[PDB]
Design an enzyme around this catalytic site. Structure first.
Site, PDB file in Angstrom:
ATOM      1  N   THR A  78       0.850  -1.178   0.000  1.00  0.00           N
ATOM      2  CA  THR A  78       0.000   0.000   0.000  1.00  0.00           C
ATOM      3  C   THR A  78       0.889   1.232   0.000  1.00  0.00           C
ATOM      4  OG1 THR A  78      -2.161  -0.621   0.913  1.00  0.00           O
ATOM      5  CG2 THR A  78      -1.068   1.333   1.884  1.00  0.00           C
ATOM      6  N   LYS A  96      -7.579   2.712 -14.335  1.00  0.00           N
ATOM      7  CA  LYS A  96      -7.720   2.430 -12.902  1.00  0.00           C
ATOM      8  C   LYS A  96      -9.077   1.779 -12.716  1.00  0.00           C
ATOM      9  CE  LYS A  96      -6.716   2.622  -8.442  1.00  0.00           C
ATOM     10  NZ  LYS A  96      -5.477   2.392  -7.676  1.00  0.00           N
ATOM     11  N   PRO A  97      -9.170   0.461 -12.891  1.00  0.00           N
ATOM     12  CA  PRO A  97     -10.485  -0.202 -12.847  1.00  0.00           C
ATOM     13  C   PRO A  97     -11.187  -0.123 -11.505  1.00  0.00           C
ATOM     14  CG  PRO A  97      -8.677  -1.762 -12.865  1.00  0.00           C
ATOM     15  CD  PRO A  97      -8.088  -0.461 -13.255  1.00  0.00           C
ATOM     16  N   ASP A 128      -6.670   8.459  -8.393  1.00  0.00           N
ATOM     17  CA  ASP A 128      -5.384   8.210  -9.047  1.00  0.00           C
ATOM     18  C   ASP A 128      -5.379   8.656 -10.508  1.00  0.00           C
ATOM     19  OD1 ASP A 128      -4.716   7.112  -6.589  1.00  0.00           O
ATOM     20  OD2 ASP A 128      -4.693   5.047  -7.291  1.00  0.00           O
ATOM     21  N   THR A 176      11.657  -4.787   1.826  1.00  0.00           N
ATOM     22  CA  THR A 176      11.299  -4.772   0.404  1.00  0.00           C
ATOM     23  C   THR A 176      11.726  -6.046  -0.312  1.00  0.00           C
ATOM     24  OG1 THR A 176      11.519  -3.558  -1.689  1.00  0.00           O
ATOM     25  CG2 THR A 176      13.448  -3.634  -0.312  1.00  0.00           C
ATOM     26  N   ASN A 185      11.885  -9.211   0.651  1.00  0.00           N
ATOM     27  CA  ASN A 185      10.850 -10.218   0.871  1.00  0.00           C
ATOM     28  C   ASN A 185       9.570  -9.879   0.112  1.00  0.00           C
ATOM     29  OD1 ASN A 185       9.915 -12.594   2.293  1.00  0.00           O
ATOM     30  ND2 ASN A 185       8.595 -11.152   3.425  1.00  0.00           N
ATOM     31  N   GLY A 228       9.500   3.531  -6.147  1.00  0.00           N
ATOM     32  CA  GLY A 228       8.550   4.627  -6.271  1.00  0.00           C
ATOM     33  C   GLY A 228       9.020   5.932  -5.655  1.00  0.00           C
ATOM     34  N   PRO A 239      12.797  10.163  -7.930  1.00  0.00           N
ATOM     35  CA  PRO A 239      13.238  10.937  -6.765  1.00  0.00           C
ATOM     36  C   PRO A 239      12.066  11.284  -5.867  1.00  0.00           C
ATOM     37  CG  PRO A 239      13.393  12.212  -8.794  1.00  0.00           C
ATOM     38  CD  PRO A 239      13.173  10.797  -9.201  1.00  0.00           C
ATOM     39  N   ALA A 240      12.323  11.239  -4.560  1.00  0.00           N
ATOM     40  CA  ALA A 240      11.326  11.613  -3.574  1.00  0.00           C
ATOM     41  C   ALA A 240      10.728  12.974  -3.915  1.00  0.00           C
ATOM     42  CB  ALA A 240      11.971  11.634  -2.194  1.00  0.00           C
TER      43      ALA A 240
HETATM   44  N1  LIG Z   1      -4.335  10.423   4.339  1.00  0.00           N
HETATM   45  C1  LIG Z   1      -3.996   9.861   3.151  1.00  0.00           C
HETATM   46  N2  LIG Z   1      -4.473  10.321   1.975  1.00  0.00           N
HETATM   47  C2  LIG Z   1      -4.126   9.749   0.801  1.00  0.00           C
HETATM   48  N3  LIG Z   1      -3.288   8.698   0.686  1.00  0.00           N
HETATM   49  C3  LIG Z   1      -2.739   8.136   1.801  1.00  0.00           C
HETATM   50  C4  LIG Z   1      -3.075   8.712   3.116  1.00  0.00           C
HETATM   51  N4  LIG Z   1      -2.426   8.007   4.055  1.00  0.00           N
HETATM   52  C5  LIG Z   1      -1.721   7.051   3.404  1.00  0.00           C
HETATM   53  N5  LIG Z   1      -1.891   7.134   2.066  1.00  0.00           N
HETATM   54  C6  LIG Z   1      -1.276   6.209   1.091  1.00  0.00           C
HETATM   55  O1  LIG Z   1      -0.203   6.811   0.355  1.00  0.00           O
HETATM   56  C7  LIG Z   1      -0.316   6.391  -1.013  1.00  0.00           C
HETATM   57  C8  LIG Z   1       0.519   7.262  -1.963  1.00  0.00           C
HETATM   58  O2  LIG Z   1      -0.119   7.645  -3.186  1.00  0.00           O
HETATM   59  P1  LIG Z   1       0.238   6.888  -4.575  1.00  0.00           P
HETATM   60  O3  LIG Z   1      -1.098   6.696  -5.248  1.00  0.00           O
HETATM   61  O4  LIG Z   1       1.430   7.438  -5.382  1.00  0.00           O
HETATM   62  O5  LIG Z   1       0.664   5.464  -3.966  1.00  0.00           O
HETATM   63  P2  LIG Z   1       0.083   4.131  -4.624  1.00  0.00           P
HETATM   64  O6  LIG Z   1       1.141   3.073  -4.359  1.00  0.00           O
HETATM   65  O7  LIG Z   1      -0.245   4.458  -6.057  1.00  0.00           O
HETATM   66  O8  LIG Z   1      -1.262   3.777  -3.762  1.00  0.00           O
HETATM   67  P3  LIG Z   1      -2.762   3.595  -4.375  1.00  0.00           P
HETATM   68  O9  LIG Z   1      -2.864   2.272  -5.099  1.00  0.00           O
HETATM   69  O10 LIG Z   1      -3.674   3.597  -3.169  1.00  0.00           O
HETATM   70  O11 LIG Z   1      -2.923   4.812  -5.256  1.00  0.00           O
HETATM   71  C9  LIG Z   1      -1.816   6.283  -1.240  1.00  0.00           C
HETATM   72  O12 LIG Z   1      -2.126   5.283  -2.193  1.00  0.00           O
HETATM   73  C10 LIG Z   1      -2.344   5.800   0.092  1.00  0.00           C
HETATM   74  O13 LIG Z   1      -2.446   4.371   0.098  1.00  0.00           O
HETATM   75 MG   LIG Z   2      -2.207   4.835  -6.960  1.00  0.00          MG
END
Ligand SMILES: Nc1ncnc2c1ncn2[C@@H]1O[C@H](COP(=O)(O)OP(=O)(O)OP(=O)(O)O)[C@@H](O)[C@H]1O
Ligand SMILES: [Mg+2]
Ligand SMILES: Nc1ncnc2c1ncn2[C@@H]1O[C@H](COP(=O)(O)OP(=O)(O)OP(=O)(O)O)[C@@H](O)[C@H]1O
Ligand SMILES: [Mg+2]
Lengths: 226, 227
Positions: B12, B38-39, B50, B146, B148, B170, B198-199
């Site tokens: 996640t 994004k289904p 997303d 990571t 594992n 990511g 990059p972050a």
């Molecule tokens: N308060 C929050 N609002 C939004 N996202 C959050 C929150 N807390 C944790 N997150 C997580 O941080 C992730 C970062 O966004 P991003 O979409 O780039 O990651 P992702 O791996 O694509 O996750 P997702 O499949 O849910 O989109 C979100 O998907 C969500 O799971």
């Molecule tokens: Mg996402």
């Protein structure tokens, strides 16, 4: 021969030590002989010592390990940093077979996850379960994502005919929350939830802990480990 | 049709969306027509969207959703909590097949990790990649745990003969810690590390994000995805 279990975790910091502790303490209170083996301990720099925590919390004295690396990395990563090979596959398997004896419950705590390199060369906790015919106890969160990780780990276990002795949520929070509450019923639907330790249990003194551990696990189930 | 890639994560919140936006941007730059799909979207009552973010960042317009659930829960539970069903298989598969077209790179973003349930019963993203003949790009972290998580995911992919298109870290921190660097190096030994965004790339505007994206990825690899 007795009963060996590997205790493995779905992720970093899910509470597998406190779960070995807990299962050791519940199984000691059923008059079973219990030994916990941690072949590879990492994170000694910051002060990790999981065998010690099982000693303090559960009172096990048969505490066996083979190597200790300071860095908080996966085993091979902490040994590649250290300049010193992981134990041989032979040492891990024979340590565990020597601990194992009729009437004894033997917990074997991985380092990191099920599929990371535990001994040289490339042999993992899953291999070690195969080599000693141990079932696998999987430690899981209740937090979002647990389902994926848990299905992934059961698949990796089945893919090598390593039986799944069940799950243990290492930290059950208070109050739950919708996700924690939903995930727990869902996890029960794909495997048996042997216990869900209350959050913060890793600080109880030895006596409080023992009463919690005795309340956490099913009486007959522990006894049936034999 | 064209080339379909599912983009799944070890966890996640590892950055699947940013990675979809970045690879789209890099592919659009190479002249490749891109569609992002994004289904199953959860957390819509939190503002989660997303597809929107992918447009915000990469200016993609060929976006295609299907299911939207208010709660920030797994798709199965978010549906139940909202008195809804999950979509059907061929509802999801029709969505992607409709998009697939020669010369197009169709990216399909999962909902959580590879084995999260997307449709009833127990239908996962892996089952979908099998049906549309897709490979899987896997988005990972460099944090410990990571290797594992990435090994469990690759094993699950191989068990159904879904080819791994590579990894994408990511979020990658500058400068990188000793755990990060070590894990990255070991990740590269597991599979090809297509990129390491990059972050803070999600905060970039249109301009910077596009340039980050072109340099995040190998142009020869991005070129070769679509024949
Ligand atoms: N308060 C929050 N609002 C939004 N996202 C959050 C929150 N807390 C944790 N997150 C997580 O941080 C992730 C970062 O966004 P991003 O979409 O780039 O990651 P992702 O791996 O694509 O996750 P997702 O499949 O849910 O989109 C979100 O998907 C969500 O799971
Ligand atoms: Mg996402
Ligand atoms: N937000 C947080 N809340 C609580 N604990 C956290 C948080 N973030 C990181 N941690 C850390 O995660 C660790 C808990 O994991 P634990 O040590 O039980 O791991 P394990 O899987 O049982 O064993 P090992 O790490 O030895 O393999 C604690 O050190 C804790 O401080
Ligand atoms: Mg431990």
């Amino acid at each position: 021969g007795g009963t060996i279990l590997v205790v493995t975790g779905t992720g970093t910091g899910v509470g597998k030590t406190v779960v070995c502790a807990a299962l050791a303490s519940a199984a000691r209170q059923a008059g079973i002989d219990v030994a916990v083996c941690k072949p590879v301990q990492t994170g000694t720099a910051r002060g990790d010592d999981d065998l010690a925590e099982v000693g303090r919390l559960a009172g096990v004295t048969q505490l066996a390990g083979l190597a200790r690396y300071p860095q908080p990395m996966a085993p091979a990563a902490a040994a590649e940093h250290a300049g010193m090979a992981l134990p041989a596959r032979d040492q891990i398997v024979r340590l565990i077979a020597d601990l194992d004896r009729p009437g004894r419950l033997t917990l074997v705590e991985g380092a990191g996850g099920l599929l990371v390199e535990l001994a040289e060369p490339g042999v993992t906790l899953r291999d070690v379960a195969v080599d000693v015919a141990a079932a696998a106890l999987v430690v899981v969160t209740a937090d979002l994502g647990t389902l994926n990780h848990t299905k992934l780990t059961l698949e990796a276990l089945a893919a090598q005919q390593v039986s799944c002795a069940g799950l243990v949520i290492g930290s059950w929070p208070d109050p739950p929350g919708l996700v924690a509450a939903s995930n727990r019923s869902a996890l029960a639907r794909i495997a048996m939830v042997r216990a869900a330790l209350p959050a913060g249990a890793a600080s109880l003194d030895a006596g409080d802990f023992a009463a919690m551990s005795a309340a956490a696990f099913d009486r007959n189930w522990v006894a049936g480990l034999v």
